[PDB]
Amino acid sequence: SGAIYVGNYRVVNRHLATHNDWANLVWEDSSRDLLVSSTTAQGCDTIARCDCQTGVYYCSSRRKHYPVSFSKPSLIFVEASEYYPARYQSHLMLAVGHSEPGDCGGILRCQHGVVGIVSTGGNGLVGFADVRDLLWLDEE
Numbered sequence: 212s213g214a215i216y217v218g219n220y221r222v223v224n225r226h227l228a229t230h231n232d233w234a235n236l237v238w239e240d241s242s243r244d245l246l247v248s249s250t251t252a253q254g255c256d257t258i259a260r261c262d263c264q265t266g267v268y269y270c271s272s273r274r275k276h277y278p279v280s281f282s283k284p285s286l287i288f289v290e291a292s293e294y295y296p297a298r299y300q301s302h303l304m305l306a307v308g309h310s311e312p313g314d315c316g317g318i319l320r321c322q323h324g325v326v327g328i329v330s331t332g333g334n335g336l337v338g339f340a341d342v343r344d345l346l347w348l349d350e351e
């Protein structure tokens with residue numbers, strides 16, 4: 212689990228969005244596994260705008276922050292499960308790191324701020340959904 216709280220906005224994995232997220236929907240994309248919803252109180256995170264390929268991500272299934280190198284946002288895919296079983300993936304950055312399905316929502320952070328949240332992974336790969344192209348998150 213996990214969210215980015217940026218202004219009065221909440222960024223979550225689309226597949227973990229709550230009824231309240233859908234009922235207070237700002238924006239969603241199944242091909243990014245991203246969903247953004249409204250908050251009443253302002254949030255304590257800031258968003259990176261950058262092309263950093265180094266950062267640190269939170270891995271709930273090790274209670275550890277790991278420093279990683281990660282790919283630039285691209286089109287990628289997977290192999291059978293049960294909620295989305297395999298799937299492709301627009302704007303998936305990959306790194307070598309331990310990630311299980313429930314590791315989704317952990318933040319990836321570089322020197323410019325929040326980069327993304329854990330979205331996919333497998334066989335010692337962790338995939339992050341980029342939020343760095345989403346400039347509209349900072350204003351309005």
Ligand SMILES: Cc1ccc(OCC(=O)N2CCOCC2)c(C)c1
Pocket residue numbers: 289290291292295296297310311312313314315329330331332333334337338
């Ligand atoms: C962060 C993260 C997200 C998804 C993921 O795998 C779970 C899943 O989607 N499956 C598809 C591939 O086959 C295994 C089951 C993993 C390993 C990590």
Ligand SMILES: [Zn+2]
Pocket residue numbers: 259260261262263321322323324
């Ligand atoms: Zn950066």
